[PDB]
Paper text:
Human [name] (hBest1) is a [name]+-activated Cl− channel essential for Cl− transport in retinal pigment epithelium (RPE). Although the structure of hBest1 is still unsolved, two Best1 homolog structures, one from bacteria [name] (KpBest) and the other from chicken (cBest1), have been previously reported. Overall, the channel is a pentameric assembly with a single ion-conducting pathway, which varies in diameter along its length and is constrained at two narrow points: a “neck” contributed by three residues (I62/I66/F70 in KpBest and I76/F80/F84 in hBest1/cBest1) on a transmembrane helix, and an “aperture” formed by a single residue (I180 in KpBest1, I205 in hBest1, and V205 in cBest1) on a cytosolic helix. Here, by electrophysiological and structural analyses, we show that the neck and aperture in hBest1 are both indispensable [name]+-dependent gates, and their dysregulated opening by rationally designed or patient-derived mutations causes [name]+-independent leak and elevates [name]+-dependent channel activity.
In KpBest and hBest1, alanine substitution at the aperture (KpBest [name] and hBest1 I205A) significantly enhanced channel activity, suggesting an activation gate role for the aperture. To characterize how alanine substitution affects the size of the aperture, we solved the crystal structure of the KpBest [name] mutant (equivalent to hBest1 I205A) at 2.9 Å. Compared to WT KpBest, the [name] mutant displays a much bigger opening at the aperture (radius 0.9 vs. 3.2 Å) without altering the overall structure of the channel (RMSD = 0.4 Å). Notably, the structure of this region is well preserved among species, providing a molecular basis for dehydrated Cl− and CH3SO3− (radius 1.8 and 2.6 Å, respectively) to pass through the aperture of hBest1 I205A in the absence of [name]+. Consistent with this idea, KpBest [name] (equivalent to hBest1 I205A) displayed dramatically increased open probability but unchanged unitary current in lipid bilayer. While mutants with conformational changes at the aperture (e.g., KpBest [name], I180T) or neck (e.g., cBest1 3A) do not have structural alteration at the other restriction, a mutation near the aperture (D203A and D179A in hBest1 and KpBest, respectively) impacts both gates, suggesting both independent and cooperative regulations of the two channel gates. The hBest1 4A mutant is designed to be deficient in gating at both the neck and aperture, because the cBest1 3A and KpBest [name] mutant exhibit an unconstrained neck and aperture for Cl−, respectively.
Numbering used by the authors:
A (entry chain A), D (entry chain D): 22 to 289
B (entry chain E): 24 to 293
C (entry chain C): 23 to 291
E (entry chain B): 22 to 291
Write the structure that this text describes.
Amino acid sequence: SKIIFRLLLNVLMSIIAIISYQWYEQLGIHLTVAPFSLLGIAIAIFLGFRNSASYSRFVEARNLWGTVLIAERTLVRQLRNILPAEHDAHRRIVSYLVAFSWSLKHQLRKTDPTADLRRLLPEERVTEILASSMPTNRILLLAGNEIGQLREAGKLSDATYGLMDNKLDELAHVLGGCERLATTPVPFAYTLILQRTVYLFCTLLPFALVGDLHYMTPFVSVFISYTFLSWDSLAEELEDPFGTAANDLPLNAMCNTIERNLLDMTGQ
Amino acid sequence: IIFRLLLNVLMSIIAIISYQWYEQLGIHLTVAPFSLLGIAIAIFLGFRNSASYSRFVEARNLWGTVLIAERTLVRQLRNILPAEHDAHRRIVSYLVAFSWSLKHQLRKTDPTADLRRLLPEERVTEILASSMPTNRILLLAGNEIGQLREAGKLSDATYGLMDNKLDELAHVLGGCERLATTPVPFAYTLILQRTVYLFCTLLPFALVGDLHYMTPFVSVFISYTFLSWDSLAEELEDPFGTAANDLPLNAMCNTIERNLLDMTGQHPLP
Amino acid sequence: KIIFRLLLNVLMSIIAIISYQWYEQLGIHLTVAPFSLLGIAIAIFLGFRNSASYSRFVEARNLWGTVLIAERTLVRQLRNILPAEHDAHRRIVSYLVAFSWSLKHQLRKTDPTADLRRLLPEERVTEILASSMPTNRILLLAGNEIGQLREAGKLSDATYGLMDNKLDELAHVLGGCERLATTPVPFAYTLILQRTVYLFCTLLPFALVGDLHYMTPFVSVFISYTFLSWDSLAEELEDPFGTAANDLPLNAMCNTIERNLLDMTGQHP
Amino acid sequence: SKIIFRLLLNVLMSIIAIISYQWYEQLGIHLTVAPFSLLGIAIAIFLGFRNSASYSRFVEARNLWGTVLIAERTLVRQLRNILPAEHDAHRRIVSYLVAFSWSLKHQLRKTDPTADLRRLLPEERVTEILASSMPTNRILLLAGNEIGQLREAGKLSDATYGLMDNKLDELAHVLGGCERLATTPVPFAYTLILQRTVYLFCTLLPFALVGDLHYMTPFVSVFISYTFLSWDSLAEELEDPFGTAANDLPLNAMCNTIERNLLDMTGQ
Amino acid sequence: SKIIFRLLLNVLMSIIAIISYQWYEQLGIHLTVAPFSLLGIAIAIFLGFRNSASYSRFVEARNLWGTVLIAERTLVRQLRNILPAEHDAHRRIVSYLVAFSWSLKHQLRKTDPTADLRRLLPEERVTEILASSMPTNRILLLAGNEIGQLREAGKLSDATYGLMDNKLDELAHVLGGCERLATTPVPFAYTLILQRTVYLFCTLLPFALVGDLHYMTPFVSVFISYTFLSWDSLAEELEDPFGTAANDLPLNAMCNTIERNLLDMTGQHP
Ligand SMILES: [Zn+2]
Ligand SMILES: [Zn+2]
Ligand SMILES: [Zn+2]
Ligand SMILES: [Zn+2]
Ligand SMILES: [Zn+2]
Ligand SMILES: [Zn+2]
Ligand SMILES: [Zn+2]
Ligand SMILES: [Zn+2]
Ligand SMILES: [Zn+2]
Ligand SMILES: [Zn+2]
Ligand SMILES: [Zn+2]
Ligand SMILES: [Zn+2]
Ligand SMILES: [Zn+2]
Ligand SMILES: [Zn+2]
Ligand SMILES: [Zn+2]
């Protein structure tokens, strides 16, 4: 992993420590364990809480995408149970809903939505969408129109119109939810100080351990350092949920899963 | 888990009869650093277990909602269309199918017997055809509700009162799928799992200094405490897991099936 | 009976003191630092555990709080929307009061027939007792009152819906309570903590006595009180529908609910 | 506060402990610092969690009062956007809504609503309200009547009556909330368990510290005692958020804001 | 960061400890680590919790502002969807909504709204608003009259009027949510209780540290003093998240984003 260099720099710090041990008392430098326990504990506490934030936030990102799936399932269902005749409205609204998903993925990944949109929508609509500075939000507007048309067509009463509007309000909360997550990281200060104090602590560690361990310092100073670094490096792997790294959310697969659902619900 | 306590008891007896040669080559092991280690590990097991618990509780609430929504939906059908018992039985079928289908979905088991029992094989082929069978069942339930509305028997206002219930089931389906395919840390629950193991096997080697012949007893006390708390996290982290406790999920589906037959007068026997 | 094993710990100290003489002559040594470790780990786990229990107790308290709110405002909607319909008003209210007591009985695993017969006609009592879930049944009946008022033109779909929502909220309380009860916190959870906290407490003197000697029991009792006070509080909060000291005054809560609902419909004790 | 008494009571336990450490070996009492680390840390952890539960109880209280201002604000707003003419239902309802706030404050403060209530209401109902064992609930039932009246007087549709009924529901939940936080205190075993243990731990502490610290004992021990006592004290200035205090909710200030706010939205 | 001052000051104190260590038993002052190791872990635990409380406040504040964006977006959507033609109502309502954000941030930052207020509204209104002792709430009420007017003009039905109405309720909740976090901070028993205690501990720490560290008591004490002091002040920063510190909320960006959004392309739509 990205973790295995500091682990080794640690072994080499154990070794710089073993064969440097006697010029110690000469200088007057002595290093006991006790204050490094007070430190190491206070750091474990702060590590603990921080990781908690990181995990909460990765979970919130998962919830949010989970909701896209639930609302578009519902909204499609409602269209099938209320207007089971109109399949043109069906196919239209479904393509916007699928478009919203891909569009939001692209948005969070800062990639180009254009191919996906052109695959699902008429070119005139793609033009409308990409013209907006907020293309994903503009897709809700369009979906909202199809709904709105059916309403004044008289196919939908204000009641049933409202049932479907509420699902658009949910997609609206996913969109803001995601935008917020993507511009509001766990504050920088956390991951900075923890990263400094944890790294310092791990490299200073075999120095204040050698007096007690002698030769069995590497296999213990490593084991202690693996532990703190495995924990601090779990926050890292949980703080970019919209990424493309292995342990980020599989938004591509999720978008494919969403599209496959709404198509199962409409015969295609 | 009872296996690596013996391994611990052995690793102790190894460290006893062996911590004669340790003095040779100057290799030492205090208790202070294994106390910094262990308290940090304990702090992290704390937070980890806290996350795991939270996933367990969320799964309970979700299933909790199935019971609530289905009871309310069926109550709504009785209070609003007290006469329409053919619709009452069709919808209660789907709702009961929904729950079992869900359970089977999360446990990765075959739902066919349960579906075949509850619904006409036309609809069972249809549902089994789909790759989202539980979702398909909601859609069918929606149709029954929908048809009562075209038929003129439900107003848009009172159709809505029921449609809310199906949204509530929709949210449960999604929530559960998110928990089932959502091991938040991909195989880093594996790194932390082994970190506790190394610590519980290296520990008697570190403790033997101050305890001697008492080492296997105080080393296995401590190991059991850590291994227990850790196994508990694994059990909670995965409430629908490849080896969970089915009892409550089965209990929940039987409760809701019983509940609904009661509400629609199928019970007690005439 | 927590003073029960506070007492036993004192003797274990004595057993540790009395026998400290001949276990220099037994090849046994027991230091504090390992028990500091173990003891802190357990403290940390007790800390999180206890936290989860309080959360369950607050939820239960809160669900019950919602019975009172929902039922109050269902009655308020009955009065504001149908001021003339006092027959409905009292039937419904007798169901909602029946709902509350039945819920207490359900949670307490006790017979609701007394309280039921008191509040409702026996034909209804039988209908309700015939059911796998009498509280469910009672919501269904309250539902028909509301719903018959609708067939009869006296409630619109809109205002029927307003009241249906309240029945819906009660359903949620019912399921919530049902869940907090049929979900005793995971099996391999409490069993590990009692032994660990017990075993640790009764072994602590054997380790404390090298440092403390005759002081062992005073210190060892203090430490064990602390851990046990904490561990036992978790238990009594864990089952909030029981009859323990901080176990919700469910009878009192039920009375408050009945006095409230009677005060809204013009009646007196 | 009352704290400083047992700060000094601790300084005196320190001196007693110093000038009786000589009779220790004589009496047979050894007191090492290490078991009081295990203890003190455990007590800290339990103190940490407890304090945490009290904070959240206080926050729930603030949110509940937050909801009163919000609900009453938008109920009045809804009245002005739906029935902008009918200023005499406006004034009746705004006075009922203000009565509610005050009646709630008084109910929680376990004091007397009669003065504040007569200032706001015609006493043909002020006696009705005070003749109920649940005055504040009765004030909602009456606010409900005004809305109920406007509905059956055709000035409100079901739709619009609904929109406003939902705001009464919201106040009902605040009432329940507050009452619940009043009658169900934080489980009482928490408090006494904790400061039997905290106070007993701080008085017993110098007798174990003196072996190591000698004359430095009162300084260090008063510090440690300050810390714990402080934290434990903070938890109880938060456990009773409706109470008689300066670290409690400025309930009077909050009702004054609410009353000005509702008068301000109607032009008085 | 007023930390470097206190960090170096600690280095002073940490030298004083090194020069006066062998004169300890001459003055009668022994000072071990365990009492400070105890004291310090307790302060860690409390710092950990309090910082957790602070982040909660930050996170909620961030959430409340996220909702301004969401709710305003969908209210405009609802108006473009239900009354697609009514663009002069659209324009009026959007200005009130953009006014609402700016007005709120000024309210929370304790600054003057009038610049931003006139930038957006007719002057006859910029004083109806500035006149109320609660302006953000007055701006809402104004946005409400617009929706209400469309409703009496029969352009909106009670149903669709309600859809829009709810979105203004959602905004009333952000308003109160934000006042709650402003007016009520966390108890200022966070000098006497936390800020001063962490420091008194940090300066005394080397005096109890030297005997062990000898010639390392400025370093290890400044490492420890860093860690503790970082977390106390980060905590203090995050609790006032409408503040202007480096880790507070970007209220100004957020209001731009809201503004750019509702005026998405000079207010034009499909
Ligand atoms: Zn939904
Ligand atoms: Zn179709
Ligand atoms: Zn990434
Ligand atoms: Zn529901
Ligand atoms: Zn039937
Ligand atoms: Zn049955
Ligand atoms: Zn309610
Ligand atoms: Zn009546
Ligand atoms: Zn509201
Ligand atoms: Zn007026
Ligand atoms: Zn008049
Ligand atoms: Zn009086
Ligand atoms: Zn919304
Ligand atoms: Zn327009
Ligand atoms: Zn020196």
